[PDB]
Design a protein around this ligand. Structure first.
Ligand SMILES: *[C@@H]1O[C@H](CO)[C@@H](O[C@@H]2O[C@H](CO)[C@@H](O)[C@H](O)[C@H]2NC(C)=O)[C@H](O)[C@H]1NC(C)=O
Ligand SMILES: *[C@@H]1O[C@H](CO)[C@@H](O[C@@H]2O[C@H](CO)[C@@H](O)[C@H](O)[C@H]2NC(C)=O)[C@H](O)[C@H]1NC(C)=O
Ligand SMILES: *[C@@H]1O[C@H](CO)[C@@H](O[C@@H]2O[C@H](CO)[C@@H](O)[C@H](O)[C@H]2NC(C)=O)[C@H](O)[C@H]1NC(C)=O
Ligand SMILES: *[C@@H]1O[C@H](CO)[C@@H](O[C@@H]2O[C@H](CO)[C@@H](O)[C@H](O)[C@H]2NC(C)=O)[C@H](O)[C@H]1NC(C)=O
Ligand SMILES: N[C@@H](Cc1c[nH]c2ccccc12)C(=O)O
Ligand SMILES: N[C@@H](Cc1c[nH]c2ccccc12)C(=O)O
Ligand SMILES: *[C@@H]1O[C@H](CO)[C@@H](O)[C@H](O)[C@H]1NC(C)=O
Ligand SMILES: *[C@@H]1O[C@H](CO)[C@@H](O)[C@H](O)[C@H]1NC(C)=O
Ligand SMILES: *[C@@H]1O[C@H](CO)[C@@H](O)[C@H](O)[C@H]1NC(C)=O
Ligand SMILES: *[C@@H]1O[C@H](CO)[C@@H](O)[C@H](O)[C@H]1NC(C)=O
Ligand SMILES: *[C@@H]1O[C@H](CO)[C@@H](O)[C@H](O)[C@H]1NC(C)=O
Ligand SMILES: *[C@@H]1O[C@H](CO)[C@@H](O)[C@H](O)[C@H]1NC(C)=O
Ligand SMILES: [Ca+2]
Ligand SMILES: [Ca+2]
Ligand SMILES: [Ca+2]
Ligand SMILES: [Ca+2]
Ligand SMILES: [Ca+2]
Ligand SMILES: [Ca+2]
Ligand SMILES: [Cl-]
Ligand SMILES: [Cl-]
Lengths: 791, 792
């Protein structure tokens, strides 16, 4: 006969009912020293009584409506579960009694716990009795090979975990921790969320299991792992009662920084949503089912009364727990005078599910009632009769039930027995009028939209941590700027890293970089390694200061030469001292002009033409000068052996000699005008690699040797006062040549790009300038000075 | 139910065994009234288990001491591995208590964690002891919900720990998981995921299966298995819930993986088929420890459908064995020893022993109830119960405090969670050479009593991989990191597969699998392979360096030529033919020469502050002494304008002191610090001297240069006086050779790094001093050595 505290009402058809009027049982572990007696449940749940009242109201409204099942009455045998499996199981045993004078229940509306409903459906489905639950939302109840006769008016919990992952990815967090009740409601949900979050590149720090029967040390361990972690977001998948201990311990230890992502079961629970817990838990964003509309329901709630309720039996205990009677009292108080979750509501969510379940079973019964004997759902097109209806026929009609909810909706269960709905997203607020927690809706989750466009959050209503209004930071490692790259911290997950600076020559312009990048050759990483600047080129220029200085030297020397030439064009035909070979003087002139014009060849950017001509031009001009001054000595050789031409011979001999090696280059190895970077790694250089090193050595040795023999045979006659004793002048000029050449070679041999050209150019310009001076100064001075040359 | 094994007695036990493997797959669309479902495939192992229970019961009934005059009856049913059959059997068990709101006292068995949960939810309602023998889920240890559930099989958390330990023992880190979607696979796989993740082991994929998943789910699972690179696959499932996946695997011929079997299917007969074995090679599984039930086999060899009225399962057993009918009509004369079945083709009793132990434990609980004495009982006030009217909760209370010895001499004692622990044997699938059946050879042990870390013990010499090879296959996400490289993140992949990037020059990485390169200190530099750092190369001038030897030999030869000049003077000092000049001035000039020549040695070795800070003023004072003494070696014009030759020394003992002032200035303003420098080379260290006062170096050199220049100008104006071999041109050429020395010196020094700075200084000073000595002395020393004619 089941328990004695129950709600009961007769009728042709009887429906079952399991509601959590209490919260749990008295935890007295029977040591079995005596016969174990029937355990007792302890706490009270006004929400559960609201649900039971909703079911009773639905049945009464069905019995009152004249169209749905006329000339037939609905009865019920509603029991209490106290949220435990033992009570539900004894109740269901009282249900299926007559199967194998007692009424035979045809349908069961209840089992609000996914652990409770599992154990109930295991037993009901053995007799094929339809069980229409309203609040059990575990996914395991979708295995229609196990629970053959289980339907539910509440959506499955897959979309809830998907929505959790979507919310976490929307606020751009990647470091969370998960808590789930060690039950059939938290385990599968947390597993689904784990996979959905790992596929979205989200890292999970910790994962713990709790329950209302967990001892104190395990709660200590959980609080420790919560405190010892850096994750700010905590995804809780549990119900009110199985969460209350953890909340009490967290309030006692005063952990304040975290953010709670509430599941639907406890996001609106009065056990948790109280101010002293709110000050500590801070910000909670949770889900909620869609509201309902049961017109005329409040006026039914306001009529509950302990003496005017013979059918309902829990009304007495309700009166007691709400007024503390039997301190005996009157029984004529007002339910509106005290504030309890009973009528302190604005949106009916689970009560609407109970209403819908009762109405769906009534509609299946009507469907069986309005049959046509030819188009039935059973074998041979036959159909069943409502006077001897059995449970399996009602199950058959429920599988194919498809009707219209008074809100103008379409109600029809899937092939997995469940319905589907679109969630509201609420965020906990503190009412400035009362102090109580009030749930304000801030977002929506439409599950019909395509994957990726389902969530809609209105961010300006979310109140973060009570005061501030920017999204808190809950990443593992700080995201560091461009110029840096991620760096593995071994042991830690893929979301936690250090970041190391990029070396020079590599850059990174992106945030969250995986590796730095080498830029092309003529580019180089800048000072912040964020963008490569074209690598600086360097060479001798014209706007450059030293460029202008040597240009000044060259042009002034050429101007001196042009002055000498003009003067000689004025006074050519006077052999006063020009009795010597005037042609030899003019040839010295043009040779020195070519020398001074060889300057320009080392001023700009060296292309191949430039230096490929800058070696031979200097070569020929310099050997012309030195050979002219060589043969410009005494005619000893002439005495030993047409016109001046014979002397020309010697020069037009010796020049050609050098010229030979010259052409060698142009047909063995031109001086390559190329670049070089290895020497600086920051600034590029451009020079000319000499085509043949030993051949350049040969060239300079040839010209210098000739000048040396000139010095020898010049100072052997170094004491003859002819033409103002030019012997000392030629020796002085050649000593100038040798000093500049010697001061040139070593410093040159160890110079980098620009200064090789610089040194060579200054050496040549100085040598030729000194020659010009030391040879023409005395003569032009005595002509401009004392016009008397006869001896 | 109708078919059952029933025997009467004073005390009744219950049993639940999977005689069949499942029910006939047929979906009732409920067009007609549903009827009793039927079971399809036979299971000889379950029948051996049932026979073990019956054998234990009858043997206890035959013992004189254990339950001396009592009698044990039993009512054994079949679960068909489904929940509905078990639940209707249970409803048949609790009929006596159900009528409150043939009473059994205890039930032995569920065989399935789902069946166990569904049964214990109902049995714990009446406090009836349920002693399972194979239910190994961890959810049944929650004694707040399953009050009266005891099991004689170890829990399955140790199994997940053992699997993680095996994986990290064979050095794998890229694996994948498969689980049955029931109360046995899900908790085990979650526990293994935790245990692996804490050991830094990656899990590539994670799937769920069941015997009811249709072709598309299995195809998606096979796609996930194939499109991955993990070789090791852990499977937490039973035989039936795994058979479809195995069929699909053997059809698609996936033939590369390594299977880590859980206990349920490691020794299963549905999976251990020779045809499946070709593609499921290299199977490594767990097993319970063997038992000894003496006299069991002979009891098995007596089954017969006629002489078994208590047992009812014998008829269908014979029909399934001989494939007969009681199509060809059957006859009770066959030989159960002829056909080969999982019935009698066994070698170790592992789950039959658990049934034996469960029955014996219930018997010993009843015994403890029986040999109790008043005042020493366990119930209220020390009171004790009567065995002739024993109730279920009393046997439960006695079972919680049960402690006895097995037939093998072990201590059976249920933990406070109602489960006794045991070791694991580790088997590996082999192929029998004779017939061809799969043979399970024991290759390892797992002791749960040893401390964490030294529990597993594998014998590598017996494991054979893939049938032919004998080296452990490679199943890592990425190949290892060789020395010289470092790990590099791939943005999307997990932590355990990376890339290999090279360490830059200046950093090294000797360790394998290094997360970052290390920079060697100031003294060292990377190798070529960036493996270890080798010391740098400091570049300072040696004394054994070739150029060092050339220049020091130059110095010593010049110095001994100076000493030879001094010896020549010692021979012919008092012959003033030319020494009538200032002899003391000659000696002082010669001393200035020797000390100038010797100043070279102070720029040869490594610079301390002593050596360099004194090497500067040595050259300074020596060279200015030289230039001042030759300055005074000129004609006495100043002397004519203005007592004793000492007067000239005034000038020199003036001039030197002047510059020595500057000397002391640097000596205590910012002396030339002898320090290192690498910034300009990045490979080689230059140790040089930075002179803290550039203006003081300028002071010294410019002062000496201006002295020389003024003396040169004044000697130049008088460069044409042929008295005393016309030394005027000699001294002007002297100052000019010194000046070209200095002229070539300054740009070279200006345009060099460390080494050639000192090289240039030494070269220039040696050159100038050599030239001065030669030009000033060679003339007169030649006039004496060559021309013995000295009169004017
Ligand atoms: C925490 O880490 C995540 C990445 O794991 C960051 O999310 C990125 O945010 C930027 C800016 O919107 C996007 O361009 C990226 O596409 C996001 N990454 C991914 C995978 O979507 C997040 O910004 C980090 N949190 C903070 C405060 O920076
Ligand atoms: C799913 O959530 C969405 C959000 O409103 C609801 O879909 C809307 O319903 C109304 C009426 O059909 C339309 O005006 C809107 O255009 C719909 N939005 C979209 C994107 O289609 C819907 O009501 C929710 N699901 C249920 C069963 O109510
Ligand atoms: C599990 O672990 C080992 C088996 O390897 C058993 O301990 C050994 O038992 C024998 C005899 O009992 C001793 O001689 C050894 O010294 C033991 N070895 C160690 C390391 O202790 C142990 O008995 C097994 N546990 C059970 C319940 O059988
Ligand atoms: C696969 O990855 C694991 C992870 O390191 C490697 O395990 C290492 O193996 C060497 C050899 O014994 C050990 O010295 C290391 O200590 C191990 N690493 C860790 C963190 O324990 C394994 O070597 C890799 N597989 C192969 C074939 O290289
Ligand atoms: N889905 C929840 C049931 C539930 C929904 N809302 C609730 C509110 C309070 C308690 C329980 C619930 C479960 O599986 O347990
Ligand atoms: N332990 C498994 C059942 C099991 C163990 N060993 C077995 C051998 C054969 C069949 C089933 C089993 C479970 O929890 O369900
Ligand atoms: C709890 O922690 C917060 C952190 O600031 C602090 O403000 C508050 O005073 C603490 N309250 C108690 C009771 O410890
Ligand atoms: C309760 O008492 C009466 C009867 O219901 C009602 O009119 C009254 O408004 C209620 N009291 C309050 C404070 O609302
Ligand atoms: C049944 O479903 C269809 C569409 O699915 C809809 O048109 C109809 O209104 C529903 N109800 C009935 C009674 O057909
Ligand atoms: C199956 O896989 C194995 C290994 O690749 C190969 O030898 C064999 O040919 C394949 N096909 C069949 C039918 O076995
Ligand atoms: C047949 O039964 C008996 C056993 O007593 C014996 O002849 C023999 O063992 C059996 N046959 C075979 C092949 O074992
Ligand atoms: C259990 O039995 C053994 C053998 O009598 C004994 O050693 C032990 O003390 C007993 N009690 C416990 C708690 O093990
Ligand atoms: Ca309930
Ligand atoms: Ca609640
Ligand atoms: Ca780790
Ligand atoms: Ca079973
Ligand atoms: Ca099996
Ligand atoms: Ca990924
Ligand atoms: Cl509600
Ligand atoms: Cl076995």
């Amino acid at each position: 006969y089941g328990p004695n505290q129950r709600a009961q009402k007769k009728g042709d058809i009887i429906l079952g009912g399991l509601f959590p009027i209490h919260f749990g049982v008295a935890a007295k572990d029977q040591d079995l020293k005596s016969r174990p007696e029937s355990v007792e449940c302890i706490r009270y749940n006004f929400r559960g009584f609201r649900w039971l009242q909703a079911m009773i109201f639905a049945i009464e409204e069905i019995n009152n409506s004249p169209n749905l099942l006329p000339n037939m009455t609905l009865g019920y045998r509603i029991f209490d579960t106290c949220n435990t499996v033992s009570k539900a199981l004894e109740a269901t045993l009282s249900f299926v009694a007559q199967n194998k004078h007692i009424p035979s229940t045809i349908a069961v509306v209840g089992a609000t716990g996914s652990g409770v409903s599992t154990a109930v459906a295991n037993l009901l489905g053995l007799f094929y009795i339809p069980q229409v639950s309203y609040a059990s939302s575990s996914r395991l109840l979708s295995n229609k090979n196990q629970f053959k006769s289980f339907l539910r008016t509440i959506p499955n919990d897959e979309h809830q975990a998907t929505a959790m992952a979507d919310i976490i990815e929307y606020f751009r967090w990647n470091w969370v921790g998960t808590i789930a009740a060690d039950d059939d409601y938290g385990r599968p949900g947390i597993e689904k969320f784990r996979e959905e979050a790992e596929e979205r590149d989200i890292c999970i720090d910790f994962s713990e299991l709790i329950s209302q029967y967990s001892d104190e040390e395990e709660i200590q361990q959980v609080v420790e792992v919560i405190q010892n972690s850096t994750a700010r977001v905590i995804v809780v998948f549990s119900s009110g009662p199985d969460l209350e201990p953890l909340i009490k311990e967290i309030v006692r230890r005063n952990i304040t920084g975290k953010i709670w992502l509430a599941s639907e079961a406890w996001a609106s629970s009065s056990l948790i949503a109280m101010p002293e817990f709110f000050r500590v838990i801070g910000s909670t964003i949770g889900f909620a089912l869609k509201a309902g509309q049961i017109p005329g329901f409040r006026e039914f709630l306001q009529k509950v009364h302990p003496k005017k309720s013979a059918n309902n039996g829990f009304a007495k205990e309700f009166w007691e727990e709400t007024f503390n009677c039997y301190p005996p009292c009157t029984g004529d108080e007002n339910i509106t005078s005290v504030e309890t979750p009973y009528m302190d509501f604005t949106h009916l969510r689970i009560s609407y599910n109970v209403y819908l379940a009762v109405y769906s079973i009534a509609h299946a019964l009507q469907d069986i009632y309005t049959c046509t004997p030819g188009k039935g759902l059973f074998t041979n097109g036959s159909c069943a009769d409502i006077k001897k209806v059995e449970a399996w026929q009602v199950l058959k009609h429920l599988r194919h039930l498809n009707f219209t909810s008074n809100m103008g909706e379409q109600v029809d269960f899937d092939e997995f027995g469940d319905l589907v709905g679109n969630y509201s997203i609420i965020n906990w607020h503190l009412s400035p009028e009362d102090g109580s927690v009030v749930f304000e809706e801030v977002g929506h989750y439409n599950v019909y939209a395509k994957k990726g466009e389902r969530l809609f959050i209105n961010e300006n209503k979310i109140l973060w941590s009570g005061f501030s209004k920017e999204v808190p930071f809950s990443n593992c490692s700080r995201d560091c700027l461009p110029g840096t790259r991620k760096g593995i911290i071994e042991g830690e997950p893929t979301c936690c890293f250090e970041c190391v600076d990029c070396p020079d020559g590599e850059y990174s312009d992106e945030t969250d970089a995986s590796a730095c990048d080498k830029c092309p050759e003529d580019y180089w990483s800048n000072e912040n390694h964020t963008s490569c600047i074209p690598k600086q080129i360097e060479f001798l220029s014209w706007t450059e200061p030293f460029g202008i200085a040597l240009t000044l030297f060259a042009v002034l020397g050429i101007f001196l030469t042009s002055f000498v030439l003009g003067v000689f064009t004025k006074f050519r035909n006077t052999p006063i001292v020009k009795a010597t070979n005037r042609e030899l003087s003019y040839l010295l002139l043009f040779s020195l002009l070519c020398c001074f014009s060889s300057s320009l060849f080392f001023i700009g950017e060296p292309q191949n033409w430039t230096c490929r001509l800058r070696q031979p031009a200097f070569g020929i001009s310099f050997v012309l000068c030195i050979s002219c001054i060589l043969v410009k000595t005494n005619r000893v050789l002439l005495v030993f052996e047409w016109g001046l031409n014979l002397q020309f011979l010697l020069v037009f001999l010796c020049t050609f000699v050098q010229i030979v090696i010259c052409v060698i280059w142009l047909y063995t190895a031109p001086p390559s005008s190329y670049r070089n970077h290895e020497l600086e790694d920051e600034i590029i250089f451009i020079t000319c690699h000499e085509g043949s090193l030993m051949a350049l050595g040969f060239l300079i040795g040839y010209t210098c040797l000739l000048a040396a023999i000139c010095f020898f045979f010049a100072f052997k006659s170094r004491k003859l006062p002819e033409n103002f004793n030019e012997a000392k002048f030629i020796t002085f000029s050649m000593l100038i040549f040798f000093i500049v050449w010697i001061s040139f070679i070593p410093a040159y041999a160890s110079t980098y790009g620009k200064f090789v050209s610089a040194v060579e150019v200054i050496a040549i310009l100085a040598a030729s300038f000194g020659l010009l001076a030391c040879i023409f100064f005395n003569k032009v001075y005595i002509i401009l000075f004392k016009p008397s040359r006869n001896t």
